[PDB]
Amino acid sequence: EISTHYVQGSHSEENEALLLGEDGNPVQKGDSLKVVPPIYMPHTQAQGATKIYLSNRGKNIRKPLEGLASLLKDPRYEFLFNADDWSVNLDGKTNKDLD
Amino acid sequence: EISTHYVQGSHSEENEALLLGEDGNPVQKGDSLKVVPPIYMPHTQAQGATKIYLSNRGKNIRKPLEGLASLLKDPRYEFLFNADDWSVNLDGKTNKDLD
């Protein structure tokens, strides 16, 4: 919903236009376990420079997603989102089960 | 209400833009006796790919249909939806009648 595609028309995930640093590496590639979101180049496809177009697939749920992120970073909801042994990894595997 | 026509403007059932596999067959054709819904190609009419427009005949009853689908698979409604000798098959034929 926020990241921009490097090529207009299509919004393929392999054409992510992340703002790269001076050394070459991206400034903020983003993290999944951490709730920090990645940084993206500004949406401006004018003449002179390369044409970068915004995401063409996002819905209108930016506000609920921001609320969910705020809940995820809240230490008062650990009993739901950061359970002791029933934490879910990125691939969907927990230490224990419901039994 | 979900499956999208392969061509915009017309919503013919024969133009179902389903998601096909590498071999050529669709990923999920869908079943009637089973409650699995068919898979469809994502709605996208941008450049590069074909123009995919969702069907315009769909009503606003997605939630009641989802509820009915959930009820159909509930084993607590066997006496209603899955009577032993009064189960209606696809073409509307019953083994026995109300007599």
Side-chain angles (χ1 to χ4, degrees), chain A residues 1-4 7 9-10 12 17 21 24 26 30 32-33 35-38 42 46 48-49 55 57-58 61-65 67-83 85-99, chain B residues 1-4 7 9-10 12 17 21 24 26 30 32-33 35-38 42 46 48-49 55 57-58 61-65 67-83 85-99:
Chain A
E1 205 153 328
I2 62 159
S3 188
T4 179
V7 286
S10 56
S12 172
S32 281
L33 293 168
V35 187
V36 60
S55 294
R57 66 200 161 185
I61 55 185
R62 186 169 177 170
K63 182 190 291 293
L65 286 178
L68 164 65
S70 80
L71 261 66
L72 279 167
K73 314 188 60 47
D74 202 318
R76 277 196 299 290
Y77 294 81
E78 302 285 73
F79 65 88
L80 292 175
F81 295 104
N82 196 327
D85 264 332
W86 293 263
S87 45
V88 180
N89 290 336
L90 296 180
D91 53 354
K93 165 164 50 179
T94 66
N95 222 327
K96 296 207 177 182
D97 213 337
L98 273 189
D99 48 353
Chain B
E1 190 175 0
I2 296 170
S3 185
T4 177
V7 297
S10 67
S12 171
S32 280
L33 291 179
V35 194
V36 63
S55 298
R57 64 188 166 170
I61 57 184
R62 183 164 172 164
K63 175 64 57 66
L65 270 295
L68 161 67
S70 75
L71 276 182
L72 283 177
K73 293 177 71 68
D74 207 322
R76 316 201 60 219
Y77 293 76
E78 297 292 326
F79 65 88
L80 260 179
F81 300 131
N82 202 330
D85 284 332
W86 291 260
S87 46
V88 177
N89 72 274
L90 289 175
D91 62 357
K93 165 164 50 179
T94 62
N95 192 359
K96 312 191 180 181
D97 209 339
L98 289 196
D99 56 353

